[PDB]
Amino acid sequence: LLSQANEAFVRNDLQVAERLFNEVIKKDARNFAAYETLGDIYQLQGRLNDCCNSWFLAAHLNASDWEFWKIVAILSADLDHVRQAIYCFSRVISLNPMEWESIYRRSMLYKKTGQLARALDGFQRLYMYNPYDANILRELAILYVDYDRIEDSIELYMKVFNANVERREAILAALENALDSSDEESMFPDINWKKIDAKYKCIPFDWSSLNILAELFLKLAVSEVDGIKTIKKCARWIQRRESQTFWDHVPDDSEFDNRRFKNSTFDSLLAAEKEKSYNIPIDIRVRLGLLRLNTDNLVEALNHFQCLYDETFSDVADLYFEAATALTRAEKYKEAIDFFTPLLSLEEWRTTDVFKPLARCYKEIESYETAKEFYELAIKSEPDDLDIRVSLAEVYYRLNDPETFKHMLVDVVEM
């Protein structure tokens, strides 16, 4: 009777006679080739769900054949069948705890679902077994952030930083010893560098990594000074100025600014250490501004923000906003308005997000006449918020027009 399998499968190669497999399955489902082929066939006929189904049940008779369960998993995943994918993957990993694609996708799906721990175990294991992959680091860091565990997330990057430092020092020491020792002779030591490149194979620590680190430091909001110091240090290891230790002992944030010219130890340096990159990317400077703002150091923060004017506006309109908001949150309105106002130039930024805080800023300054405007613009584009109406209502009260104020409140209380 089994022959009917073979007779069919070969003769079903072309067309719908394949759906006569469905007669072969009825007598006994336990045969694999039937389901597997049925899946192979549905995969070809175009219909995906029936296929995925066939493959799933197919998978269940060769339990521990995880190379198949993986396929079922990814297929289920692409079909937006999450729990199926997670389940199949989970078994694939239960059987083979060293399939990183599966663990990755599964952990991503866990991250999606909300089971952050289950994802975190995976990403931990993944990073552990592959510390030279930036995306894994990013994701694991993000997970650590979502877990209110920023410290680990920061240590994660500081490790990479220190690794880069070690690498640099190793290279320099190597070529130094080689060069100096050689120069005593005429030749040059046959020294191995692949050993150097391997033994010190860190993830490259560039400005992006530092920006991420900065963001992580902002998200921390605890002992921001140490953060700023670290940012400056790493930013100073970049630009190859780590030799300059004294910058660690100045709070002025004098470096990365012209003020450095007024420093005593600086002027004493050789022009070789000078003429080096002292300028940082704006993406980081702003964050230093914010991190400075966190410490009620408005002066430096503003000195950092003031560098936004020099940059081409459109390329950093996103940062003006952040800078503007942080100032409102910092009860610094007179300064916030200066960074809110330029956004009005671009149409895309004419939204409530910019109109509320502006209005509040002008409200708090006791220049209500101009706050009224933006509150009206905020409500206009677009309705509605209770609090905004109440704010505008403040404006009307403090404008000695409580009648209107009240009528507004009573107008909005209804809906």
Overview of the molecule:
This protein has 415 residues and is mostly helical. It is 67% helix and 0% strand. The chain is built from 22 helices and no strands. α8 runs antiparallel to α9 (134-146), α9 packs antiparallel against α10 and α19 packs antiparallel against α20. It is flat. The relative contact order is 0.04. Residues 1-415 are annotated as: Sufficient to bind BDP1. It comes from Saccharomyces cerevisiae (strain ATCC 204508 / S288c) (Baker's yeast).
What integer value in Å does the Rg equal?
Answer: 32 Å
CATH class category label of one domain: Mainly Alpha
Report on the biggest sheet: none
Q: What kind of assembly state do the chains in view correspond to?
A: monomer
Could you please say which CATH topology of one domain applies here? Answer: Serine Threonine Protein Phosphatase 5, Tetratricopeptide repeat
Per-chain topology:
Elements: H1 3-11, H2 21-27, H3 32-45, H4 48-59, H5 66-78, H6 82-95, H7 100-113, H8 116-129, H9 134-146, H10 150-184, H11 194-199, H12 207-220, H13 224-237, H14 264-268, H15 282-293, H16 298-305, H17 317-329, H18 333-340, H19 352-364, H20 368-380, H21 386-398, H22 402-413
Subcellular location: Nucleus
Protein name: Transcription factor tau 131 kDa subunit
